[PDB]
């Protein structure tokens, strides 16, 4: 018996990541096994680590955490360094509009656990972590129970299936900080400290948990790994375009008829996501903007872009927040500003003061209480959050808002 | 002096024994203490620090850092209301208004009887079901006042 | 996009069954949820099955299919028999004058679906059926869609809301036979056969679908169930008189100003239905008779009867077909005879030949071509349809016509 | 020598997979066959039986039993006219007359072009909107000749 969870709508054309998670309920190990689950693992343990890395490499799998970094390449880097090595599943998912990872955690936990075990074997890690945000209490309890189920069936512990490979997966809970999703702050938090990002380089694969080689991957990323081993990398690469192959999840929210998570190939356009899959807009109103979480803002002139990791592509986590023609862009930008205000960790001075002043001045503008200096000040700070920043929050906290400024000048100009 | 009741002390020990190193258990321990008391008692940090074999300072820094932990206000039920962009756009204000009609309180406030506290929070990762709220660990979509009133009646 | 449906007027003094179905359009799951929909289900799943049966029992709820059988008591019979068990919603509605069930199906499908889930749970049925007449295609598509909406919101499928209770609802369509609304013929039809009633006993609750305990309930009956759970049985019983409590639907047609479906308490009199609610008669002409579907004929001297299931009461489905002073009763009797002629299934000899002969001889009488023998023959067959009959069609096929002979002798004598 | 078109075979197969047992899909399949061809072709019955895993005899008796199915007259549109008590009281005859004036046919008959067939049926469960008719799945109240003519012009 688990805490109540809203039943997020989920739809797939590929029937992989969402083969079970398209149904809004916990799938336990018997159901997973009946569907051929844990067979990829068995096949993995009959292969060398190096070979597993090679398949994942050739699959073109990229990170589903937002940066789209090649997964196989990440692993190769870790294994160049002396052990012991650690594996970490990043389930902090706290970006606005992003709710793709939780339906895997909550509905198909064994797909993730299987992925963690294969991934851990591939990089020689005998100890793995799931770090799950504290606002996912049900996911936590569900994962804990699924791990036990896996233990009882001999998929975890010492000498898994006679292979000689040992693994325990520990589940850690966050406690309210967006920043703990940043991989170095994640690790700090796992070490029992505050969530303060560290300067990269070193990257985790060189120095991470207790200073040792560490691979951090996103929940979605890891959930692809059982499929790659199962189908082979060639069959995997047929899904979608050859360069950006395989399933990708798209959490779609806001002014669409069918908000939810869509499993789609990456040659899908943004227009297709909204109109073909998500059922079009509420009230059949015109699209005004799409917010890619709190990262980017696309105008209605940018809907014919692919949902891939190309230069002209949507990229990111695939998060699609739709705003229509009546929605005030300044009001929406204020909400993005308020978010970064609440989540700067404060180690870097321009980020600390910039995120705060961006929100505080934008609120003045919004309420019509802004002096001329407040306006000029707002412009300035928006452009000056980034300098000296040691992590990506500082580098992007002004990005989306700047984009609204450039793409909707007429609506901003009206706030004078 | 302050000392944890045995049934809580036991659970803190289970968390501390779960990870390879004691200090990794800090956040689970604090979630546990908050679950038990309805808040983090200031006087609980000292003995928790000894169990973690950490300085008191380190523990205090952590509690202050992580938004979920509250050291000011006891409450039996925490109504976490999302105030980020998607929930705001789809009707956070209607949820808050409905909350004020039923409970008589606004974000940040506790009811007189110490039963409900409303906590505004950032995106909860259920944006498709906006506007979203939690009642302790239970998470729901807000549909209407009549629907909300029925849900809240489930927490005695 | 559904097939065209006439916009049947609907009006309620109670605001329960017709709370939404008073507006002539489909109400999808979002509107249903806004009105507190599916919260009764959630409360139901935190009660035991036995508790739910007690509540339905204590509500005084009776069947709205026409026989007024106590619903609680029907359920109690089923659950004393070993499982597995089946739940059936009877949406065959094909009695002349009767169009009460369709407005629920077509306008508020989730009220019905919610009812089906709670009732299935109460009797331990993991598989339920809606059997809807073939001449209601819109209701069919509307139900299919609504069931999908419920699945997506997690109200159907396996382990509904973490309760451990599994349910699928299948929707079957009829194909032209009034007899398939008879509960045992319905079951025969569901099994993929001709609609031939079975000898009772056994009743379905002992032996029904695939020979297993089966509860058949009428649409309107099932639609009451969410209210009973939501209000509790005590509050529900405050509606109307305490012996025949709760809402009832009355489809009114013929020579009234405001024909349509009325949601009313059962202490309402027949005269109130026609004059207080249905706007009185077309042209303020005197009431001649009321046909209770094809079952009973009430004269102008019987309008002050309660619309309840007392011995002196209207009873039936609540169908009120009004004829006024200029309407020829023999002509109307002919139409009723023709109905039974077309719908006898012919398994039983007196029903087979009797239904045909009643209509054939009455036609001759109407057209002024009846011999003395035809007259005496018609009287005799009218009184001799029922012997050996194994279902209610043969039992009543002479009933209304007999009543017109007794209550309107002057008009019949005109034809002789 | 008789095979269903693939786009029809698929639909039939969907119905057969829908219920727990194949034979429960029989009337849905038949509806689909009639929808597709404008009637039930006798030669369709043999292979439908195979797919249902039923004797042909079973299937034939089913078709004959259920009045909606028609093995004789192909028609693109079926004008179902209620001839029961309430519609007869409120003007079935006026509707039949209007249909004869517009289309040139009476109950039982088919227009020379194979477009329209009038089918007399018992009560259609819409008695308050008497007199009632359907055009395939669409259902209407008859108001007048001119109103009926407009409606019929929508079926091409
Ligand atoms: N899913 C969510 O809830 C969520 C929340 C906030 C932010 N994000 C995303 O986070 C992204 C920023 O993440 P980031 O700063 O970690 O990105 P990054 O580009 O700095 O690194 C991405 C990944 O690649 C690895 N990497 C990169 N270069 C490497 C190298 N040379 N050697 C070894 N490893 C290397 C990093 O260690 C990391 O694991 C944004 O694009 C945003 O979309 C997602
Ligand atoms: N709504 C319509 O379109 C429509 C059409 C035709 C007929 N009808 C109605 O059908 C009615 C007759 O139906 P019927 O023959 O099912 O009535 P019935 O009295 O024989 O049965 C009523 C219900 O109670 C159950 N029941 C009765 N005695 C039982 C017992 N001893 N143990 C267990 N269960 C028992 C039956 O199974 C059935 O479900 C008529 O009054 C007529 O109004 C309605
Ligand atoms: C502020 C901030 C916040 C987050 C991140 C970044 C930054 C800058 N990242 C990305 C994270 O650091 C890292 O790139 C990924 O976890 C690596 O996994 P993949 O390569 O995507 O599999 C991130 N990733 C993830 O998996 N979940 C999350 O919740 C977040 N949150
Ligand atoms: C010829 C004939 C035709 C019908 C029926 C009976 C007979 C004799 N019955 C009544 C049916 O057998 C049964 O009593 C009810 O369906 C049981 O449900 P309730 O107890 O009324 O909810 C019936 N009931 C119903 O709900 N819809 C219908 O269309 C019909 N049709
Ligand atoms: S950029 Fe901002 S969030 Fe990142 S480490 Fe510096 S102060 Fe913290
Ligand atoms: S009484 Fe008439 S309708 Fe009923 S089973 Fe016998 S023949 Fe058929
Ligand atoms: S914006 Fe409220 S849950 Fe995401
Ligand atoms: S009598 Fe014609 S629809 Fe009922
Ligand atoms: Cl193998
Ligand atoms: Cl100390
Ligand atoms: Cl209202
Ligand atoms: Cl055969
Ligand atoms: Cl006539
Ligand atoms: Cl006829
Ligand atoms: Na979920
Ligand atoms: Na967190
Ligand atoms: Na790295
Ligand atoms: Na970065
Ligand atoms: Na009407
Ligand atoms: Na209707
Ligand atoms: Na029927
Ligand atoms: Na039969
Ligand atoms: Na029964």
PDB file of N, CA and C in Angstrom, chain A residues 374-415:
ATOM      1  N   UNK A 374      14.951  50.510 -12.118  1.00  0.00           N
ATOM      2  CA  UNK A 374      14.554  49.129 -11.886  1.00  0.00           C
ATOM      3  C   UNK A 374      14.535  48.369 -13.212  1.00  0.00           C
ATOM      4  N   UNK A 375      14.012  49.019 -14.258  1.00  0.00           N
ATOM      5  CA  UNK A 375      13.971  48.456 -15.598  1.00  0.00           C
ATOM      6  C   UNK A 375      15.374  48.165 -16.116  1.00  0.00           C
ATOM      7  N   UNK A 376      16.226  49.200 -16.104  1.00  0.00           N
ATOM      8  CA  UNK A 376      17.597  49.093 -16.579  1.00  0.00           C
ATOM      9  C   UNK A 376      18.363  48.074 -15.738  1.00  0.00           C
ATOM     10  N   UNK A 377      18.075  48.055 -14.430  1.00  0.00           N
ATOM     11  CA  UNK A 377      18.694  47.122 -13.503  1.00  0.00           C
ATOM     12  C   UNK A 377      18.320  45.683 -13.834  1.00  0.00           C
ATOM     13  N   UNK A 378      17.030  45.474 -14.120  1.00  0.00           N
ATOM     14  CA  UNK A 378      16.520  44.165 -14.491  1.00  0.00           C
ATOM     15  C   UNK A 378      17.252  43.651 -15.735  1.00  0.00           C
ATOM     16  N   UNK A 379      17.312  44.490 -16.778  1.00  0.00           N
ATOM     17  CA  UNK A 379      18.007  44.137 -18.002  1.00  0.00           C
ATOM     18  C   UNK A 379      19.419  43.680 -17.657  1.00  0.00           C
ATOM     19  N   UNK A 380      20.108  44.505 -16.857  1.00  0.00           N
ATOM     20  CA  UNK A 380      21.513  44.290 -16.559  1.00  0.00           C
ATOM     21  C   UNK A 380      21.690  42.947 -15.844  1.00  0.00           C
ATOM     22  N   UNK A 381      20.906  42.687 -14.791  1.00  0.00           N
ATOM     23  CA  UNK A 381      21.177  41.531 -13.949  1.00  0.00           C
ATOM     24  C   UNK A 381      20.845  40.269 -14.743  1.00  0.00           C
ATOM     25  N   UNK A 382      19.771  40.317 -15.546  1.00  0.00           N
ATOM     26  CA  UNK A 382      19.400  39.199 -16.404  1.00  0.00           C
ATOM     27  C   UNK A 382      20.616  38.751 -17.217  1.00  0.00           C
ATOM     28  N   UNK A 383      21.412  39.724 -17.696  1.00  0.00           N
ATOM     29  CA  UNK A 383      22.588  39.449 -18.501  1.00  0.00           C
ATOM     30  C   UNK A 383      23.829  39.121 -17.664  1.00  0.00           C
ATOM     31  N   UNK A 384      23.739  39.046 -16.327  1.00  0.00           N
ATOM     32  CA  UNK A 384      24.946  38.969 -15.508  1.00  0.00           C
ATOM     33  C   UNK A 384      24.762  38.033 -14.309  1.00  0.00           C
ATOM     34  N   UNK A 385      23.999  36.959 -14.505  1.00  0.00           N
ATOM     35  CA  UNK A 385      23.889  35.894 -13.521  1.00  0.00           C
ATOM     36  C   UNK A 385      25.044  34.904 -13.694  1.00  0.00           C
ATOM     37  N   UNK A 386      25.485  34.749 -14.952  1.00  0.00           N
ATOM     38  CA  UNK A 386      26.380  33.692 -15.400  1.00  0.00           C
ATOM     39  C   UNK A 386      27.817  33.858 -14.890  1.00  0.00           C
ATOM     40  N   UNK A 387      28.449  35.054 -14.955  1.00  0.00           N
ATOM     41  CA  UNK A 387      29.885  35.169 -14.669  1.00  0.00           C
ATOM     42  C   UNK A 387      30.318  34.525 -13.351  1.00  0.00           C
ATOM     43  N   UNK A 388      31.426  33.761 -13.421  1.00  0.00           N
ATOM     44  CA  UNK A 388      32.070  33.064 -12.307  1.00  0.00           C
ATOM     45  C   UNK A 388      31.266  31.845 -11.842  1.00  0.00           C
ATOM     46  N   UNK A 389      30.088  31.580 -12.428  1.00  0.00           N
ATOM     47  CA  UNK A 389      29.245  30.476 -11.987  1.00  0.00           C
ATOM     48  C   UNK A 389      29.970  29.150 -12.190  1.00  0.00           C
ATOM     49  N   UNK A 390      29.800  28.210 -11.252  1.00  0.00           N
ATOM     50  CA  UNK A 390      30.493  26.932 -11.351  1.00  0.00           C
ATOM     51  C   UNK A 390      29.561  25.805 -11.798  1.00  0.00           C
ATOM     52  N   UNK A 391      28.266  26.067 -12.027  1.00  0.00           N
ATOM     53  CA  UNK A 391      27.340  25.025 -12.471  1.00  0.00           C
ATOM     54  C   UNK A 391      26.287  25.640 -13.388  1.00  0.00           C
ATOM     55  N   UNK A 392      25.464  24.773 -13.983  1.00  0.00           N
ATOM     56  CA  UNK A 392      24.584  25.148 -15.078  1.00  0.00           C
ATOM     57  C   UNK A 392      23.388  26.001 -14.647  1.00  0.00           C
ATOM     58  N   UNK A 393      23.041  26.037 -13.353  1.00  0.00           N
ATOM     59  CA  UNK A 393      21.917  26.853 -12.906  1.00  0.00           C
ATOM     60  C   UNK A 393      22.249  28.319 -13.175  1.00  0.00           C
ATOM     61  N   UNK A 394      23.465  28.724 -12.798  1.00  0.00           N
ATOM     62  CA  UNK A 394      23.908  30.095 -12.978  1.00  0.00           C
ATOM     63  C   UNK A 394      24.033  30.434 -14.459  1.00  0.00           C
ATOM     64  N   UNK A 395      24.453  29.449 -15.257  1.00  0.00           N
ATOM     65  CA  UNK A 395      24.690  29.672 -16.679  1.00  0.00           C
ATOM     66  C   UNK A 395      23.383  29.886 -17.458  1.00  0.00           C
ATOM     67  N   UNK A 396      22.225  29.439 -16.938  1.00  0.00           N
ATOM     68  CA  UNK A 396      20.984  29.497 -17.710  1.00  0.00           C
ATOM     69  C   UNK A 396      19.872  30.274 -16.989  1.00  0.00           C
ATOM     70  N   UNK A 397      20.087  30.730 -15.756  1.00  0.00           N
ATOM     71  CA  UNK A 397      18.978  31.299 -15.005  1.00  0.00           C
ATOM     72  C   UNK A 397      18.378  32.509 -15.727  1.00  0.00           C
ATOM     73  N   UNK A 398      19.116  33.129 -16.662  1.00  0.00           N
ATOM     74  CA  UNK A 398      18.602  34.283 -17.392  1.00  0.00           C
ATOM     75  C   UNK A 398      18.182  33.970 -18.834  1.00  0.00           C
ATOM     76  N   UNK A 399      18.422  32.732 -19.283  1.00  0.00           N
ATOM     77  CA  UNK A 399      18.380  32.371 -20.692  1.00  0.00           C
ATOM     78  C   UNK A 399      16.953  32.482 -21.235  1.00  0.00           C
ATOM     79  N   UNK A 400      16.001  31.773 -20.605  1.00  0.00           N
ATOM     80  CA  UNK A 400      14.618  31.720 -21.073  1.00  0.00           C
ATOM     81  C   UNK A 400      14.017  33.122 -21.082  1.00  0.00           C
ATOM     82  N   UNK A 401      14.279  33.878 -20.011  1.00  0.00           N
ATOM     83  CA  UNK A 401      13.690  35.197 -19.843  1.00  0.00           C
ATOM     84  C   UNK A 401      14.221  36.143 -20.922  1.00  0.00           C
ATOM     85  N   UNK A 402      15.525  36.047 -21.212  1.00  0.00           N
ATOM     86  CA  UNK A 402      16.145  36.811 -22.284  1.00  0.00           C
ATOM     87  C   UNK A 402      15.445  36.491 -23.601  1.00  0.00           C
ATOM     88  N   UNK A 403      15.105  35.209 -23.809  1.00  0.00           N
ATOM     89  CA  UNK A 403      14.482  34.767 -25.048  1.00  0.00           C
ATOM     90  C   UNK A 403      13.087  35.368 -25.204  1.00  0.00           C
ATOM     91  N   UNK A 404      12.309  35.413 -24.115  1.00  0.00           N
ATOM     92  CA  UNK A 404      11.005  36.065 -24.148  1.00  0.00           C
ATOM     93  C   UNK A 404      11.197  37.531 -24.513  1.00  0.00           C
ATOM     94  N   UNK A 405      12.255  38.145 -23.962  1.00  0.00           N
ATOM     95  CA  UNK A 405      12.545  39.548 -24.201  1.00  0.00           C
ATOM     96  C   UNK A 405      12.793  39.786 -25.687  1.00  0.00           C
ATOM     97  N   UNK A 406      13.518  38.864 -26.334  1.00  0.00           N
ATOM     98  CA  UNK A 406      13.859  38.990 -27.745  1.00  0.00           C
ATOM     99  C   UNK A 406      12.686  38.589 -28.644  1.00  0.00           C
ATOM    100  N   UNK A 407      11.846  37.640 -28.204  1.00  0.00           N
ATOM    101  CA  UNK A 407      10.861  37.067 -29.112  1.00  0.00           C
ATOM    102  C   UNK A 407       9.495  37.728 -28.947  1.00  0.00           C
ATOM    103  N   UNK A 408       9.244  38.358 -27.790  1.00  0.00           N
ATOM    104  CA  UNK A 408       7.973  39.024 -27.535  1.00  0.00           C
ATOM    105  C   UNK A 408       8.213  40.460 -27.075  1.00  0.00           C
ATOM    106  N   UNK A 409       8.945  41.297 -27.849  1.00  0.00           N
ATOM    107  CA  UNK A 409       9.269  42.663 -27.420  1.00  0.00           C
ATOM    108  C   UNK A 409       8.039  43.539 -27.189  1.00  0.00           C
ATOM    109  N   UNK A 410       7.018  43.339 -28.032  1.00  0.00           N
ATOM    110  CA  UNK A 410       5.817  44.161 -28.022  1.00  0.00           C
ATOM    111  C   UNK A 410       5.082  44.009 -26.687  1.00  0.00           C
ATOM    112  N   UNK A 411       5.088  42.799 -26.114  1.00  0.00           N
ATOM    113  CA  UNK A 411       4.358  42.508 -24.890  1.00  0.00           C
ATOM    114  C   UNK A 411       5.122  43.009 -23.662  1.00  0.00           C
ATOM    115  N   UNK A 412       6.459  42.926 -23.704  1.00  0.00           N
ATOM    116  CA  UNK A 412       7.312  43.511 -22.675  1.00  0.00           C
ATOM    117  C   UNK A 412       7.223  45.036 -22.714  1.00  0.00           C
ATOM    118  N   UNK A 413       7.366  45.607 -23.921  1.00  0.00           N
ATOM    119  CA  UNK A 413       7.334  47.052 -24.119  1.00  0.00           C
ATOM    120  C   UNK A 413       6.046  47.631 -23.527  1.00  0.00           C
ATOM    121  N   UNK A 414       4.982  46.821 -23.446  1.00  0.00           N
ATOM    122  CA  UNK A 414       3.699  47.306 -22.962  1.00  0.00           C
ATOM    123  C   UNK A 414       3.715  47.470 -21.438  1.00  0.00           C
ATOM    124  N   UNK A 415       4.703  46.876 -20.753  1.00  0.00           N
ATOM    125  CA  UNK A 415       4.872  47.054 -19.314  1.00  0.00           C
ATOM    126  C   UNK A 415       5.723  48.298 -19.020  1.00  0.00           C
TER     127      UNK A 415
END
